[PDB]
Ligand binder design. Structure first.
Ligand SMILES: Cc1cc2nc3c(=O)[nH]c(=O)nc-3n(C[C@H](O)[C@H](O)[C@H](O)COP(=O)(O)OP(=O)(O)OC[C@H]3O[C@@H](n4cnc5c(N)ncnc54)[C@H](O)[C@@H]3O)c2cc1C
Ligand SMILES: NC(=O)c1ccc[n+]([C@@H]2O[C@H](COP(=O)([O-])OP(=O)(O)OC[C@H]3O[C@@H](n4cnc5c(N)ncnc54)[C@H](OP(=O)(O)O)[C@@H]3O)[C@@H](O)[C@H]2O)c1
Ligand SMILES: Cc1cc2nc3c(=O)[nH]c(=O)nc-3n(C[C@H](O)[C@H](O)[C@H](O)COP(=O)(O)O)c2cc1C
Length: 641
């Protein structure tokens, strides 16, 4: 049931594919690998998420095992796989003597401890007597080769397994893991986009005395919340950054300052049409899925309608995998298209040249190859099993839980830029952020027709559940936390939207200090950065905070795109203030680093190592050593995405 060795064996599984994924990138790969393993060798594969089983009986698995693992924080596994991680990292010598395995790890050489989770896992497994088949995969998200790195690894590993298991190959064909059935009418027990089953009429939400919706909210059960206040934070005519405030009072959701909110999106309507159209699918088509065996888990709530699945369940937007092309060879519209497809599916460069570079979505790519010709010979089941599941997007809460107990503010820079290849094509946009903007404009009664909103969304949702600008959401507890003692000095470094956590930190300290109106607040310094003065987040708030925190606060701003001047980064300002900074560090100061800006984590860490190197007059190595210590002792925290 939860005993891995037992489940494999009880379902006569030939192969075991395991995956530890947060954002669901490994999940998707693991699944692709399984489908190909079944298409080519007919093997009865089990594709399990390492968080739904108890690997104590791992050494009793009579089948070869593939492990897809991602990396987060210090080279470590993704929360929600901590169990799996512990089993593996606390495995004694000769504890996995029977385990034959191969693994593909996902990473980003932009971080330190690049793919350190897969690396760590591999180090323990071998040591626990487990033999590794084929090369250790290593996807580099930083270099944007993740998908190709897989393709490469995948092919080699398949030759490794063809041998080890003496498998006879066969032209690869699709084999649904479900029993696709087409219903005739919609019920209160059938979904139309509802986040989870609990929100279907036939089910009852679990409230309490005063109706407060209860239950634990997470990836399996969100909490539809109403954005009670929105506003634009920028003032540029190109970029946009929305500030959204969610009212969580209607539930029993508590959150700590420095946590994360996960927003569950819905595809933009213009993109939903495109998908439906190129495949010639009927939105209304009611269908249902029946797992063809115990280990198969239905992807979303069913029954449901095809349009409800393409608008709420599948990630119909994003980079097209070459492997997806290779999988569509079967269902190619005509012979000429079936041809172009076969070539692109094998030539890495051609695929990048004809597809990747143009920023195509699946719909677009397919339309491109077919010149409009519809792929009406593709089964919804294929799509359900071939298009990545939609996933929630995380945000760093910018509100303090001390002064906003049940209100969560979210600072979200909008992802919407012009296609660099096709000047005439629609901008490359991001689902969730442009969604939040739509709600920001709508809610604020702005003639959207005027604005530069690239797309729009169903703002009523499933059975008007999202009625009144509400979205599925849930809090993800983190370890980004202000020092226990208020007296402790604090150093916060966050460029762009990376200030979101610190807004809260500051609001938290400002709130606390007024809860005394005694306590002297240790020094707090925030190093902010942004292009110009149009993208200066909460510019008007900071001065107001400084009044209340007096000489306990200090903000240091760097701009990188001011006309007629040198480009300035926070790590530049750190060295300018290397004495104030070095002193604080010698005072038990805590160092917080948050933001995106690829290479900003390493850069900032490297500036600190230098501030330390110079300060204590030590080598650059000793200094990086001291910095690794701060990161282990929790004095140096990071929230870099
Ligand atoms: C722990 C954590 C904390 C975070 N905190 C914050 C925060 O405080 N603030 C914040 O703004 N973000 C934060 N993020 C980032 C955020 O979760 C999302 O990455 C961001 O909002 C983008 O969302 P989206 O819906 O636009 O993305 P998606 O729709 O998934 O798009 C991603 C990008 O791909 C582009 N794209 C679209 N189609 C294609 C295509 N066919 N080919 C290639 N590219 C394409 C989009 O235009 C976009 O730029 C955080 C992430 C994590 C993991
Ligand atoms: N990825 C997506 O990209 C978007 C980025 O949003 P954001 O506000 O964080 O980005 P942003 O506004 O580009 O980044 C914030 C600031 O950091 C600068 N920067 C870039 N690289 C840096 C580095 N290595 N070290 C220090 N500072 C650096 C930026 O200047 P530059 O002008 O030099 O980039 C800018 O001033 C999001 O929508 C996200 O989902
Ligand atoms: C918050 C965050 C932290 C990360 N930390 C690391 C890291 O320390 N090392 C690394 O190689 N990659 C790191 N990555 C990148 C992931 O390993 C990479 O994006 C991978 O594709 C994620 O796959 P998943 O969606 O299956 O989790 C990080 C990504 C995020 C969002």
């Amino acid at each position: 049931n939860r005993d891995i060795a037992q489940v494999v064996t009880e379902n006569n599984k030939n192969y075991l594919v395991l995956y530890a994924s947060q954002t669901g990138t490994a999940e998707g790969f693991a699944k692709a690998f399984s489908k190909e393993l079944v298409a080519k060798f007919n093997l009865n594969v089990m594709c399990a998420d390492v968080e739904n089983y108890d690997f104590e009986s791992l050494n009793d698995v009579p089948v070869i095992v593939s492990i897809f693992i991602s990396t987060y924080g210090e080279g470590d596994f993704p929360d929600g796989a901590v169990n799996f991680e512990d089993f593996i990292c606390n495995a004694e010598a000769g504890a996995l003597s029977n385990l034959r395995y191969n693994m593909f790890g996902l990473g980003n050489s932009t971080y330190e401890f690049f793919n350190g989770a897969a690396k760590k896992a591999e180090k323990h497994l071998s040591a626990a007597g487990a033999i590794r088949l084929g090369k250790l995969g290593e996807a580099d998200d930083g270099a944007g080769t993740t998908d190709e790195d897989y393709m490469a690894w995948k092919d080699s590993i398949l030759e490794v397994l063809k041998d080890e298991l003496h498998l006879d190959e066969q032209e690869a064909k699709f084999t649904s893991q479900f029993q696709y059935t087409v219903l005739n009418e919609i019920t209160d027990s059938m979904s139309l986009g509802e986040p989870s089953a609990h929100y279907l009429p036939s089910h009852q939400l679990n409230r309490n005395a005063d109706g407060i919706q209860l239950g634990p909210f997470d990836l399996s059960q969100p909490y539809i919340a109403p954005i009670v206040k929105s506003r634009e934070l920028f003032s540029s005519n190109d970029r946009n950054c929305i500030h959204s405030e969610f009212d969580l009072s209607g539930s029993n959701i508590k959150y700590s300052t420095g946590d994360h909110l996960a927003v569950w999106p819905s595809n933009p309507l213009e993109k939903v049409e495109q998908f439906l159209s190129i495949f010639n699918l009927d939105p209304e088509t009611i269908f249902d899925l029946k797992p063809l065996d115990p280990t198969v888990k239905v992807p979303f709530p069913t029954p449901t309608t095809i349009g409800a699945a393409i608008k709420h369940y599948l990630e119909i937007t994003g980079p097209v995998s070459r492997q997806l092309f290779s999988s569509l060879i079967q269902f190619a519209p005509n012979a000429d298209v079936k041809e172009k497809l076969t070539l692109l599916s094998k030539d890495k460069d051609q695929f990048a040249v004809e597809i990747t570079s143009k920023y195509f979505n699946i719909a677009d790519a397919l339309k491109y190859l077919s010149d409009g010709a519809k792929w009406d010979t593709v089964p919804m089941q294929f799509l359900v099993e071939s298009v990545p599941q939609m996933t929630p997007r995380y945000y760093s809460i910018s509100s303090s839980s001390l002064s906003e107990k049940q209100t969560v503010h979210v600072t979200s820079i909008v992802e919407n830029f012009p296609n660099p290849e096709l000047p005439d094509a629609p901008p490359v946009v991001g689902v969730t952020t442009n969604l939040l903007r739509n709600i920001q404009l709508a809610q604020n009664n702005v003639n959207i027709a005027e604005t530069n909103l690239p797309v729009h969304y169903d703002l009523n949702g499933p059975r008007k559940l999202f009625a009144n600008y509400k979205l599925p959401v849930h809090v993800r507890r983190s370890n980004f936390r202000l020092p226990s003692n208020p007296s402790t000095p604090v150093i916060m470094i966050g460029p762009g939207t990376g200030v979101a956590p610190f807004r809260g930190f500051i609001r938290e300290r400002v709130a606390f200090l007024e809860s005394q109106k005694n306590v002297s607040l240790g020094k707090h310094i925030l190093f902010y950065g942004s292009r110009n003065t149009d993208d200066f987040l909460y510019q008007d708030e900071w001065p107001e905070y400084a009044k209340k925190l007096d000489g306990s606060f200090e903000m240091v701003v760097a701009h990188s795109r001011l006309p007629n001047t040198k480009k300035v980064y926070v790590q530049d300002k750190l060295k300018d203030y290397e004495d104030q900074v070095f002193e604080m560090i010698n005072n038990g100061a805590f160092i917080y680093v948050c933001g995106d800006a690829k290479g900003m984590a390493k850069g900032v860490s490297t500036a600190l190592v230098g501030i330390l190197s110079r300060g204590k007059s030590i080598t650059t190595d000793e200094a990086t050593e001291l910095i690794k210590m701060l990161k282990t002792s929790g004095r140096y925290q990071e929230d870099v995405w």
